[PDB]
């Protein structure tokens, strides 16, 4: 089997992504952020605390004649970013772009964070990380690539994120009219849970590249690009005016520059990001500061290549019996 389903930005600026998922029987659509950073799919639903829902669609068990109470199951979660979730669990029938799981863990939250009430556009989540990092107690539950994966023709997805347009996420195929040139593969490690890598180094517009190992994840569930201080720097000190703000919380920069390009390695392979990409607009509407694409891991503990970086390339998730990360130019 394969699957194949568009995903959208959510705003003008690609904070996030957003793809169409069927959840039960009659189908019910809830537009989830597929976030290759965490292993939870979880929802908004009829058991969200009401003063927590604000214009999300809400998934409604008992709706579905194919839902069953996971009896006794809760889950509970933190994102990097502060924000959090929690509640019970469902079984369930879910269908991604064609691709359908019987028995995927569906995750109803009873409570959500602030930062997820005041964004309507967003359902919920399906996690893409490894099914070790599932927060589901007492029993851990698998992520919806890890159901589907006996499954798939292939056992991989692939990420095919917009600039400022719609992409695409693949199930279980790899489509070879959708890059240009070659795929480059890379090792990956799951010893934390993440689709984590080492990058060969970094060129900032037009500059020499610099060769040196950036270990970080592949996370299209964050929207920037965090690297080493080291790196950050380099980059910002390349543009007239930018600086780091404390009272902003990360680089910015005047609103009037014209942003360098910075390239990442894959292997002997180089990734582009345009200068554009990196640039997030006014701090605050009307600003002539804008915020920065590329910033700090510094106190993150992990350095992420966030959207800003896995939308200026075809990344392919190989989730064979060895898991690598493959990625191309596009």
């Known amino acids: ?3 194949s389903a568009t995903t959208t930005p959510i705003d003008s600026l690609d904070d996030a992504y957003i793809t169409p998922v069927q959840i039960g029987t009659p ?3 809830l537009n989830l952020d597929f976030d290759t950073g965490s292993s939870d799919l979880w929802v908004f639903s009829s058991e969200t605390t009401a003063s927590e829902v604000d214009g999300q669609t809400i998934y409604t068990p008992s ?3 194919t839902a069953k109470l996971l009896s006794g199951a809760t889950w509970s979660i933190s994102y990097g970013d502060g924000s959090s979730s929690s509640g019970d669990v469902y079984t369930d029938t879910v269908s991604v772009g064609g691709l359908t799981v019987t028995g995927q863990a569906v ?3 009873k409570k959500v964070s602030s930062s997820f ?7 919920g989540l399906l996690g893409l990380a490894f099914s070790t990092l599932n927060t589901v107690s007492p029993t851990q539950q698998k992520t919806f690539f890890d159901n589907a994966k006996a499954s798939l023709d292939s056992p991989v997805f692939t990420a095919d994120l917009g600039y400022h347009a719609p992409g695409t996420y693949n199930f279980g195929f790899i489509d070879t009219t959708a890059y240009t040139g070659s795929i480059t593969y890379t090792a990956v490690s799951t010893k934390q849970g993440f689709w984590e890598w080492t990058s060969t180094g970094y060129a900032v517009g037009s500059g020499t590249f610099k060769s040196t190992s950036i270990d970080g994840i592949a996370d299209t569930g964050t929207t920037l690009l965090y690297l080493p201080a080291t790196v950050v720097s380099a980059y910002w000190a390349q543009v007239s005016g930018a600086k780091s703000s404390s009272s902003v919380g990360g680089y910015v920069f005047p609103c009037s520059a014209t942003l360098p390009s910075f390239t990442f390695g894959v292997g002997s392979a180089r990734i582009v990001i345009p200068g554009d990409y990196i640039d997030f607009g006014p701090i605050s509407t009307g600003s002539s500061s804008c915020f920065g694409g590329i910033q700090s891991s510094a106190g993150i503990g992990i350095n992420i290549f966030g959207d800003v970086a896995l939308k ?5 998730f190989n989730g064979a019996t060895t898991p690598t990360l493959g990625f191309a130019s596009k």
């Open 63 to 65: 709706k579905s004649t």
């Open 107 to 109: 995750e109803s939250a």
């Open 117 to 123: 009430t005041e964004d309507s556009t967003i359902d």
């Open 1 to 3: 089997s394969t699957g």
């Open 27 to 29: 189908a019910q659509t």
């Open 312 to 316: 200026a390339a075809f990344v392919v």
